[PDB]
Amino acid sequence: QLPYVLGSATEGTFPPFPADIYTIPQYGYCTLNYNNEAVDRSAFYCLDYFPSDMLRTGNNFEFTYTFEDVPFHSMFAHNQTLDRLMNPLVDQYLWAFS
Amino acid sequence: KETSKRWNPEIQFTSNFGNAADIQFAVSDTGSYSEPRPIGTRYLTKPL
Amino acid sequence: GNWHCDSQWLENGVVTRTTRTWVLPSYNNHLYKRIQGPSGGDNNNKFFGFSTPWGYFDYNRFHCHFSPRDWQRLINNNWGIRPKAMRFRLFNIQVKEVTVQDSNTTIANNLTSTVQVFADKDYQLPYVLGSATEGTFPPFPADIYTIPQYGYCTLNYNNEAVDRSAFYCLDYFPSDMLRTGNNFEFTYTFEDVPFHSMFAHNQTLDRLMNPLVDQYLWAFSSVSQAGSSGRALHYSRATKTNMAAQYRNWLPGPFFRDQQIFTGASNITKNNVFSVWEKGKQWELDNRTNLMQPGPAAATTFSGEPDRQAMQNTLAFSRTVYDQTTATTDRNQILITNEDEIRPTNSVGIDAWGAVPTNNQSIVTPGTRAAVNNQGALPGMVWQNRDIYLQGPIWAKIPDTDNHFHPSPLIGGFGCKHPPPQIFIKNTPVPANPSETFQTAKVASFINQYSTGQCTVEIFWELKKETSKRWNPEIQFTSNFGNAADIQFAVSDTGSYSEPRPIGTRYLTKPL
Amino acid sequence: GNWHCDSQWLENGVVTRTTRTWVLPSYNNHLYKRIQGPSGGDNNNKFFGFSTPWGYFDYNRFHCHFSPRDWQRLINNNWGIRPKAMRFRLFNIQVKEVTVQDSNTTIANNLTSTVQVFADKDYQLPYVLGSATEGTFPPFPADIYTIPQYGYCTLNYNNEAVDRSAFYCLDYFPSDMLRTGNNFEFTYTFEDVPFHSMFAHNQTLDRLMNPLVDQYLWAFSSVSQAGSSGRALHYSRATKTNMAAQYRNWLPGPFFRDQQIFTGASNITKNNVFSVWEKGKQWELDNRTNLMQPGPAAATTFSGEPDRQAMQNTLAFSRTVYDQTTATTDRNQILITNEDEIRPTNSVGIDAWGAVPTNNQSIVTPGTRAAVNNQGALPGMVWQNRDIYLQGPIWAKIPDTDNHFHPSPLIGGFGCKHPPPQIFIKNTPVPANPSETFQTAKVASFINQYSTGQCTVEIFWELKKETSKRWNPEIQFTSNFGNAADIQFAVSDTGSYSEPRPIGTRYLTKPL
Amino acid sequence: CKHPPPQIFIKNTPVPANPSETFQTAKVASFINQYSTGQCTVEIFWELK
Amino acid sequence: NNNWGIRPKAMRFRLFNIQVKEVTVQDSNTTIANNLTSTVQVFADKDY
């Protein structure tokens, strides 16, 4: 229900190296607009309006999430070309205009 | 149903703007029913 | 606890959860002090009372509990609203210990220090919440709420005390001392109050008749001269053509007139030079005269004349809670409510309520009549209350008195004998090192400290949903008209939250 | 069904069965049309609304349900009456199909055609029954009842519509289509309403005292001149000789004054030439001023002065339902009610309610006082409602508003939040032959037809019987005084039924 | 994904500096300067072909 | 104003209060009358 900024590939991701320390980036979002000024349909989301969990030192936060079915990525290349799928040793039985 | 957690209010379809002396979506004196303006379903907004 | 600012919508009701962060100063240096009114010749502004080293939570306004989107969803879909139950709880307490040295301040926690809190359930302390004053929660959840000091006025003759004036020590009341780990909570249920009317009227009070037929009731019409010295009495039945003289079962509500002002660019010149305190309406009690500020509700202006309207009745709000300016000459800075939606039932405030015959006629004396500027309740009166606004007070406490008359608060909202309790809070004093030798002098030296925390307020509201079988669409509150480049009910670049326009609950209409 | 016009009397109650034959025209050629007020400079008579191809049963008058003999038996034996339950049913429907050719009309039945009927139980349509207008059932059972057309007014600025005006299509509501064999019925139960007072008072409001004793209460009496420059305060106890200055617990009801007319042969000359719309009393709402026609009830005339009486308050009726004359200069044509029976509690309308001191006296300023022409409710007021009449309305609908004050209808009868529903009825249109080739034009050609039938209404009334222990006999309604050769409440030789005089419910008396 | 991994938001709740000991209506701009640190573990089960 | 989405689920069509009228024109004058026994035949094409 809040503008989702993760799709665009931007900075503020965890480091690749485990010893590094991760500075958490600030959250901001864009809304519908005409140039810099706001169109009538632009929205303002206050993230305080959302229920949160306040956490002290002893406290800790957790949640689990399960991906919806997505297709496997193809980690393979192809041995064959799309146009070369044919048997090289034979001829077609299909006539065509020449 | 809507669940909209944006803070500020939203556009909604209201009868207001127009000729005040004109009552909209009602019969005339002759008895002819009339639709003064088109009405679509997209008013409420949602994050893309 | 946790942070709940959301509101969840239910069948025939809604709960509004709101959460704030508060700061509590130590007021009056831990002393009960005796305040009094300003020294002057004007006896109207004088008072006598006490100020206490205490503070109180005032969450009574609508925009504390509702967001502008929740409010829209409320008012467009619903005919009525009233509160049912409430839950206030207070948690994440931490007190800070301030030390200033070398013009350099240092703040630190004290985990063992306490803050003591009690709610007055028996209404045994002067109840200051009814009057609509500052120190309410902010409308915007990210803001921080400074808890106002508690003080009260007692019976008085000018600034000096009358014999019956009282002194209440809030320490005499049992309290709950609270450290960091501790938290305070109590629940409260509203007594039955009438639903507010979130609807306007489709019909005028006098037009309730069938326009196609005539009445069967004859009525006296006129005296005419028949012959030279003779007379003739004329009677007539009211016809659909003549609706002015016609029988009716009902009358407008009680009325108290108020002067007019010209509120608009072209008309602004037609105003005479004057002040409210002179030409306005007022009521006096004991030796003081008080402006009757809201008064009984009345339509603010005529149909087709939006720019000439009543000076007394309409409420007005600031578009930010934080403005320090107490007077302004421009109306774009502040928000002004429009009372026009009660025009069918309530007569406009400008023009008189009616006219009365003042004498017994004869051939010697022609009959005389006079205008009715003020009218008390007559049998057959019906009237609407001033509607509630997003920025206006939710409730007031009906005074404890032998007699009430239709006791809805004249500012707005819901009157109660047993309103929500006042919740009092204090920093227990922690004294500075004593003198190591016993002295009899009073202890004036305390550890400078304040406390902060979070308070959640949860109110279950009962709703009366629309069922509207009118064919054509209805007026509803939309964000549209205004400056498009201006986004409304949002923060600025500086971070200041602002309310661009007032929002009332009466949009939907219903047959009278 | 069958024909029940009888009424059967029960212990502590009565049911009044009445039956009529009705005709239903096809109104507006099966169209919703937009009516508006008359074109003129007078803004008081302007309105905006709609007229519907519908009709409605208005049975709301007393003489519909009661016969003059049943009414007599009612009022002489009973202290109070209120309605309890009601049953309306509609049967023996037959629609007639009219064809006019060669200036010669031919009427025939259509057995398959339908008439659709619904009662509005949720009060979601403008309710026109409260205003007392024509189209009620006849008082005489042999007459035939033409069902009036339904139309309503909506919020307006002069004749043109304001933005909040509504349009109700009565087709959007679920209806029951009915052929000949079919019949419609529904039952309804009145919410608790107070009994009407069918009694007068034996005592005056101010005479409640024991005439044989004196009060023990002292009161200030006068200031006197003691010596030259001195003064003396005199106190006195009220004695059975002096009843004017005496303590009392109660006061007359709210009051609104009204001008006087000279209603009788010798006095008729003492009238000045004037009209109600000038010298009368009125109330204004929005930009319109409306004559306050019934107003709060008040005694119409003084004791011993029957011929000088109030012009506004008294109701008046026609002695036949069918008279087309809307104005008349003779009072023998129409019936005029006398409100004198409330004289003990209610102050007369002519003279002022009282007098108020208007200034603070001193030796420099003598005290001044002014008359009270209009008075709103004060603590300790008691008053009587205008009594119901055989020809007057039974009920009205209390408007839907936040606030009511003693909401009894100012014309008379019983106010209700949920009054008897409005029963709507219509002739479903049957179109004429189409064009045999598809056209897009609207269908204006319908088979000309109307429908008739019978409707029975049955109301159970709750009665409060007299127990009167006064020694001597009481006033009762008798047919005696009048023209002996004139038989009253009977048909003429032409067949016209007529009501010779008005009949109210207050005859029996009871101690105040 | 229609329903990708949620966005996880985090904030430092503000703790205000000492008030003025007399009630003022101005907005509270003075907060205790603070930041927070900690550890976050992320565990994703991947399906392999 | 209150809703993000809409789609139809089920539908019920029914047809009733049938009456056929029998038209006769003579002398430039039309006369319409009922025929109670005449029929009107109706079918819905479910198989498209």
TrEMBL record, chain B:
Superkingdom field: Viruses
Location of the protein in the cell: Virion
TM region positions: none
Family membership noted in the UniProt record: Belongs to the parvoviridae capsid protein family.
Descriptive protein name: Capsid protein
Gene label: Cap
Automatic annotation (TrEMBL), chain E:
Portion of the full sequence shown: 647 to 695 of 743
Localization (cell): Virion
Transmembrane domains' residue ranges: none
Descriptive protein name: Capsid protein
Organism in which the protein naturally occurs: Avian adeno-associated virus
Record family assignment: Belongs to the parvoviridae capsid protein family.
Gene name for this UniProt entry: Cap
